């Protein structure tokens, strides 16, 4: 509307699939689940206090 | 070391008097409670190790004292703790049979505080262990035998504290 130069508002799924799902650009939730990363309970029980 | 009979005789002898009616009434009270004392002593002799291990399972297990750094940590310290609790239950049985806690401060509570303070033994944790032992044996032998056990257990906890 006569104040701003344009900018890339929409991608195709091909272009977004190109840029985001590359391995360095990737997150780690994106497509299958990730399980929780707790420490082992025998290490937690073997400490020196609750 | 004296039961109710020997303490009554010692009082009447330190008086130099014969056994009057109050001493006769005290000895009649002991001779009425003695059969209950005998049956509770047999029932406690039945389940020594069970009462001790249930007392540790109630109080001392899964706390910090069985973890590293605790005074009940090693197997030597665990075995000595089971030995100490077996001593407390055995001498509480003896004081229940005698009907007098003179054996407790003669042979348990004599140098026990200074021993535990020199070793680094926690006195509050062992008082809680003796209290759980009292609770378990009072669940075992009933209301009134549990009470006449708990009076000597409270004597041991009071002399320890």
UniProtKB/Swiss-Prot annotation, chain A:
Give the source's domain of life in one word: Bacteria
Summarize what the UniProt record says about post-translational modification: Contains one covalently linked bilin chromophore. This protein autochromophorylates.
Compartment list: Cellular thylakoid membrane
Q: Which family does it belong to?
A: Belongs to the phycobilisome linker protein family.
What this protein is reported to do is described as: This protein is postulated to act both as terminal energy acceptor (by its phycobilin-like domains) and as a linker polypeptide (by its repeats and arms) that stabilizes the phycobilisome core architecture. Has intrinsic bilin lyase activity.
Q: What's the subunit arrangement here?
A: Heterodimer with ApcF (a variant beta-allophycocyanin). Phycobilisomes of this organism are composed of a two cylinder core, from which six rods radiate. The core is mainly composed of allophycocyanin alpha and beta chains and of minor components.
What is the protein name for this chain? Answer: Phycobiliprotein ApcE
Shown stretch of the complete protein: 641 to 690 of 886
UniProtKB/Swiss-Prot annotation, chain B:
N4-methylasparagine modification, residue list: 71
Sorted alphabetically, which keywords does the UniProt record give? Antenna complex, Bile pigment, Chromophore, Electron transport, Membrane, Methylation, Photosynthesis, Phycobilisome, Thylakoid, Transport
Listed Gene3D superfamilies: Phycocyanins
Highest rank taxon of the organism: Bacteria
Q: Where in the cell is it found?
A: Cellular thylakoid membrane
Q: Where does (2R,3E)-phycocyanobilin bind?
A: 81
Any one of the GO BP annotations: photosynthesis
Gene Ontology cellular-component terms for this entry are: phycobilisome; plasma membrane-derived thylakoid membrane
Q: What does the entry's PTM section describe?
A: Contains one covalently linked phycocyanobilin chromophore. The chromophore is added by the phycocyanobilin lyase CpcUS.
Q: What does this protein do?
A: Light-harvesting photosynthetic bile pigment-protein from the phycobiliprotein complex. Allophycocyanin has a maximum absorption at approximately 650 nanometers.
How does this polypeptide assemble, per the annotation? Heterodimer of an alpha and a beta chain.
| Protein name per its UniProtKB record | Allophycocyanin beta subunit
Name of the gene encoding the protein in the UniProt record: apcB
